[PDB]
Amino acid sequence: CMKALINGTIYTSFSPVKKVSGLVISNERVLYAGDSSTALRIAELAGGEIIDLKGKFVMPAFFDSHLHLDELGMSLEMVDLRGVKSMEELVERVKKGRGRIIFGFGWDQDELGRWPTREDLDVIDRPVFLYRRCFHVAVMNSKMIDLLNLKPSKDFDESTGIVRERALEESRKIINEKILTVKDYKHYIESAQEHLLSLGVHSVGFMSVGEKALKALFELEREGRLKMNVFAYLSPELLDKLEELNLGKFEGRRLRIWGVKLFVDGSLGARTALLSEPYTDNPTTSGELVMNKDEIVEVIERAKPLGLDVAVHAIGDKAVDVALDAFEEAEFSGRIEHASLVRDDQLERIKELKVRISAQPHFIVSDWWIVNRVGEERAKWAYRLKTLSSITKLGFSTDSPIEPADPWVSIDAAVNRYVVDPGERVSREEALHLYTHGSAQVTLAEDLGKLERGFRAEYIILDRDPLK
Ligand SMILES: [Zn+2]
Ligand SMILES: [Zn+2]
Numbered sequence: 001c002m003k004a005l006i007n008g009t010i011y012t013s014f015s016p017v018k019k020v021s022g023l024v025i026s027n028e029r030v031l032y033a034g035d036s037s038t039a040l041r042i043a044e045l046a047g048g049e050i051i052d053l054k055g056k057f058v059m060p061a062f063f064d065s066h067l068h069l070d071e072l073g074m075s076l077e078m079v080d081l082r083g084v085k086s087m088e089e090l091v092e093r094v095k096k097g098r099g100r101i102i103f104g105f106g107w108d109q110d111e112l113g114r115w116p117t118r119e120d121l122d123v124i125d126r127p128v129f130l131y132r133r134c135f136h137v138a139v140m141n142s143k144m145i146d147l148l149n150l151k152p153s154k155d156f157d158e159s160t161g162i163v164r165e166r167a168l169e170e171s172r173k174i175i176n177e178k179i180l181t182v183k184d185y186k187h188y189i190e191s192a193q194e195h196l197l198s199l200g201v202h203s204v205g206f207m208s209v210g211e212k213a214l215k216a217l218f219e220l221e222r223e224g225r226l227k228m229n230v231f232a233y234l235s236p237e238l239l240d241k242l243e244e245l246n247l248g249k250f251e252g253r254r255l256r257i258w259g260v261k262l263f264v265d266g267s268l269g270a271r272t273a274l275l276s277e278p279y280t281d282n283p284t285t286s287g288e289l290v291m292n293k294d295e296i297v298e299v300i301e302r303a304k305p306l307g308l309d310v311a312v313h314a315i316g317d318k319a320v321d322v323a324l325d326a327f328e329e330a331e332f333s334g335r336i337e338h339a340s341l342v343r344d345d346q347l348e349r350i351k352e353l354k355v356r357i358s359a360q361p362h363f364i365v366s367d368w369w370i371v372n373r374v375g376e377e378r379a380k381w382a383y384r385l386k387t388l389s390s391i392t393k394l395g396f397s398t399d400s401p402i403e404p405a406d407p408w409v410s411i412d413a414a415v416n417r418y419v420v421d422p423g424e425r426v427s428r429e430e431a432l433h434l435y436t437h438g439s440a441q442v443t444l445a446e447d448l449g450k451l452e453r454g455f456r457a458e459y460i461i462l463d464r465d466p467l468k
Contacts, residue, residue: 002026004043006036008053010459011060011466012451014433023058024048025457033452059432059466060451061202061458062407063439066311066337066358066397069206069230070213073188075401076195079104081130087112087120095124101144101179105131118142118161129175138163138171148174176210185216186225192400193228199406202458203229205358205397205443207261207311207337210235217255226254229458231443233259233311236299248306258444259309261337262299263290265319268340268373273316275341280375287316296326300334309444310334311358317341317381324349335442338363338399339388341374341381351391356442358395359385361414361431362403370419382419386426389434395442396435407435428467 005023012018012033022039024032032042043050079097081104084090090112094102107130109115121128121141128141140148140161148171150156155167163171196204209217209232220226232255234242239260242248250257266272266288271279274287296312303310314323315338324346327334335356340363342350350357364383371379388394396414398405414431418424426434437449447456 002031002043002046002048003051004039004048005051005053005058005459006040008036008056008058009465010053010058010451011432014059014429014436015438017429017467018452023451023457023459028457029447030451030453030455030457053461057462057465058451058459059462060436060449060455061460062200062435063203063229063395063437063443063445063449063458064196064201064397064400064405064407064435065205065395065439065442066207066360067204067400067405068208069192069204070185070188070209070216072192072195072401072405073190074103076191077103077188079130080106082106082133083111085111085113087114087116090116091120091123094121094128094130099126101127101129103129105135106133107131107139108133115139115160115162118145118159121161129171136164136168138168140171147179150174177212180212182212182215182219185212186220189213189216189220190225193226196405197228200460201228201405201407202460203231203440203443203445203448205231205233205258205311205439207233208235209233209238209261211238214238221252221255229254229256229445229448229456231256231258231445233261233309236260236262239299239302239306242306243302246306248308256445257308259311260299260303261311261313262296263313264296264322265290265314265316267315268367268370271373273340274314274319274322275316275374275378276318276321277378279373280378281372286318289319289322291322293322293325293329296323297330300326300330300332304330304332311337313337315340317343317346317378320346324353324355327353327355340383341378342384342388343381347387347391350388354392356393356395357388358397358439358442359383359388360397360399360403360410361385361417362398362410364417364419365413366403376420379420384421384424385414385434386424386430389426389430389438393438393441394434395439396431397439411435432466 003025010020010023020033022036116139127144131138155164265274272288278286312323314320337358339357411431440449
């Protein structure tokens with residue numbers, strides 16, 4: 001299969017901006033980027049298909065360097081219960097869910113008139129599990145309670161089927177690890193993939209791939225059912241099985257076994273991101289250390305002879321220190337997910353160690369409470385897109401389903417919005433670069449993100465100029 005896209009405007013690169021008028025593709029790689037007429041002549045000689053763009057625009061497809069394909073799929077399938085006015089309507093909306101188990105979200109007891117309970121949902125004859133708006137609480141029916149077998153705690157009200165805090169976290173864990181099957185995960189991943197492709201995203205860094213998600217990805221790959229480039233960053237629990245086969249870094253046609261995903265800290269919203277000084281709006285806490293420097297170095301030393309990348313979630317400024325210390329000691333150039341707060345004094349270390357960073361520009365829009373958490377001075381550390389991209393390799397992501405998956409909505413954020421410093425905005429060209437080649441570089445994918453000769457031909461076709 002050879003195709004020439006002619007008579008249009010093709011961006012091969014956004015850093016620096018380079019436009020051509022013709023593109024020849026064969027065996028899913030770019031063969032030629034240049035003159036429309038030269039491209040036409042090549043395809044005439046070799047007997048390829050001619051695609052006349054008719055003045056349309058082409059660009060490298062988006063590369064989301066950090067998301068959760070399984071969770072995105074679960075989220076697309078969930079029953080939408082936002083704005084439901086009565087228990088009667090809530091029950092009707094839940095009944096209209098397909099799954100052998102019905103998952104849903106977004107109810108509110110104020111909008112309902114009272115709290116939903118186990119007894120209200122016992123009219124539905126399959127397992128039901130329904131988040132509250134906040135996602136900090138869930139209600140379930142008896143069938144679902146029976147499947148979970150949770151131990152008694154102050155976070156679980158068995159009579160009403162309501163879970164909070166810890167017991168909700170444990171409920172999720174049991175659902176994900178015990179109850180959902182490999183087939184369920186294949187379906188989630190396929191729903192996410194369809195959604196992402198329709199948005200122009202052809203490659204993803206898939207973070208926190210657990211046992212069943214991996215089993216689903218190998219199956220989809222050999223079934224020819226993966227339609228996007230999936231760079232899988234596995235949970236560290238999978239290292240035992242990898243070491244027993246000596247299976248490490250491995251590139252299939254779509255699925256890549258690429259890395260390991262770790263977490264130093266939690267999030268600024270929950271006040272669990274690890275700060276060097278206490279929270280401005282809770283001076284009794286500085287967040288939580290989930291994995292320390294020695295524990296990260298231990299995983300890195302296991303990743304090294306398997307040729308695997310290591311991606312480390314660090315949100316708080318002190319978490320960033322822990323991640324930098326770990327990379328320094330292990331002499332390992334890893335990547336950092338989020339890097340939400342970066343101090344001036346940390347910049348030199350990031351530059352010198354060449355740490356790759358995956359950042360989510362839509363966090364700027366969503367996290368309006370940043371100044372409340374950390375104060376005016378530390379808010380200067382937040383989402384420093386322009387600064388980070390000028391000192392190291394940086395890529396754009398959504399952390400979907402946390403943020404919207406639509407890249408144009410995150411591009412708008414990176415270009416137009418800032419926490420406190422308008423100097424941290426990037427230009428439209430830079431944002432497109434970061435969401436294509438930037439992401440590719442951050443995911444160690446050297447033949448993605450551009451449409452020059454030799455690059456994998458992942459492109460999207462647009463009616464309007466993406467630079468306008
Ligand atoms: Zn994270
Ligand atoms: Zn994440």
